[PDB]
Design a protein around this motif. Structure first.
Motif, PDB file in Angstrom:
ATOM      1  N   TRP A 175      -8.025 102.446  42.516  1.00  0.00           N
ATOM      2  CA  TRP A 175      -8.823 102.700  43.710  1.00  0.00           C
ATOM      3  C   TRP A 175      -8.125 102.163  44.955  1.00  0.00           C
ATOM      4  O   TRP A 175      -8.651 102.260  46.064  1.00  0.00           O
ATOM      5  CB  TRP A 175     -10.206 102.064  43.570  1.00  0.00           C
ATOM      6  CG  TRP A 175     -11.331 103.032  43.780  1.00  0.00           C
ATOM      7  CD1 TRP A 175     -12.036 103.231  44.932  1.00  0.00           C
ATOM      8  CD2 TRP A 175     -11.879 103.930  42.810  1.00  0.00           C
ATOM      9  NE1 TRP A 175     -12.990 104.200  44.736  1.00  0.00           N
ATOM     10  CE2 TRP A 175     -12.915 104.646  43.443  1.00  0.00           C
ATOM     11  CE3 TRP A 175     -11.596 104.203  41.469  1.00  0.00           C
ATOM     12  CZ2 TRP A 175     -13.665 105.612  42.780  1.00  0.00           C
ATOM     13  CZ3 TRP A 175     -12.342 105.163  40.811  1.00  0.00           C
ATOM     14  CH2 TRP A 175     -13.366 105.858  41.467  1.00  0.00           C
TER      15      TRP A 175
ATOM     16  N   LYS B 131      -8.350 104.362  47.847  1.00  0.00           N
ATOM     17  CA  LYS B 131      -9.616 104.456  48.564  1.00  0.00           C
ATOM     18  C   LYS B 131      -9.937 103.144  49.273  1.00  0.00           C
ATOM     19  O   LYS B 131     -10.527 103.140  50.355  1.00  0.00           O
ATOM     20  CB  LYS B 131     -10.747 104.818  47.600  1.00  0.00           C
ATOM     21  CG  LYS B 131     -11.051 106.305  47.550  1.00  0.00           C
ATOM     22  CD  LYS B 131     -11.763 106.686  46.262  1.00  0.00           C
ATOM     23  CE  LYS B 131     -11.765 108.192  46.051  1.00  0.00           C
ATOM     24  NZ  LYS B 131     -11.747 108.549  44.605  1.00  0.00           N
TER      25      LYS B 131
ATOM     26  N   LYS C 283      -8.818 102.978  52.496  1.00  0.00           N
ATOM     27  CA  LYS C 283      -9.477 104.068  53.208  1.00  0.00           C
ATOM     28  C   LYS C 283     -10.869 103.651  53.671  1.00  0.00           C
ATOM     29  O   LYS C 283     -11.636 104.470  54.178  1.00  0.00           O
ATOM     30  CB  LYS C 283      -9.574 105.304  52.312  1.00  0.00           C
ATOM     31  CG  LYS C 283      -8.455 106.307  52.536  1.00  0.00           C
ATOM     32  CD  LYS C 283      -7.090 105.642  52.475  1.00  0.00           C
ATOM     33  CE  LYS C 283      -6.071 106.526  51.773  1.00  0.00           C
ATOM     34  NZ  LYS C 283      -5.357 107.418  52.730  1.00  0.00           N
ATOM     35  N   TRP C 284     -11.190 102.375  53.493  1.00  0.00           N
ATOM     36  CA  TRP C 284     -12.490 101.849  53.894  1.00  0.00           C
ATOM     37  C   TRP C 284     -12.554 101.649  55.403  1.00  0.00           C
ATOM     38  O   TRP C 284     -13.451 102.165  56.071  1.00  0.00           O
ATOM     39  CB  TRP C 284     -12.772 100.528  53.178  1.00  0.00           C
ATOM     40  CG  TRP C 284     -14.176 100.038  53.367  1.00  0.00           C
ATOM     41  CD1 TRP C 284     -15.321 100.778  53.278  1.00  0.00           C
ATOM     42  CD2 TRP C 284     -14.584  98.701  53.677  1.00  0.00           C
ATOM     43  NE1 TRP C 284     -16.415  99.981  53.515  1.00  0.00           N
ATOM     44  CE2 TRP C 284     -15.990  98.703  53.761  1.00  0.00           C
ATOM     45  CE3 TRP C 284     -13.897  97.503  53.889  1.00  0.00           C
ATOM     46  CZ2 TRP C 284     -16.719  97.552  54.050  1.00  0.00           C
ATOM     47  CZ3 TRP C 284     -14.622  96.362  54.176  1.00  0.00           C
ATOM     48  CH2 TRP C 284     -16.021  96.392  54.254  1.00  0.00           C
TER      49      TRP C 284
ATOM     50  N   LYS D 104     -12.613 104.924  56.969  1.00  0.00           N
ATOM     51  CA  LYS D 104     -13.847 105.661  56.725  1.00  0.00           C
ATOM     52  C   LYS D 104     -14.947 105.216  57.684  1.00  0.00           C
ATOM     53  O   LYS D 104     -15.449 106.008  58.481  1.00  0.00           O
ATOM     54  CB  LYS D 104     -14.306 105.463  55.279  1.00  0.00           C
ATOM     55  CG  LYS D 104     -13.887 106.588  54.348  1.00  0.00           C
ATOM     56  CD  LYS D 104     -14.138 106.231  52.893  1.00  0.00           C
ATOM     57  CE  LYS D 104     -15.204 107.123  52.275  1.00  0.00           C
ATOM     58  NZ  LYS D 104     -15.550 106.697  50.891  1.00  0.00           N
TER      59      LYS D 104
END
Length: 14
Positions: free
Chosen positions: A3, A6, A9-10, A13
């Motif tokens: 992960w 991702k 990618k926090w 986001k």
């Protein structure tokens, strides 16, 4: 560990 793509990618986001 998969992960990690991702995780970073926090900040992008929200």
């Amino acid at each position: 560990v998969k992960w990690v793509k991702k995780v970073v990618k926090w900040v992008k986001k929200v």
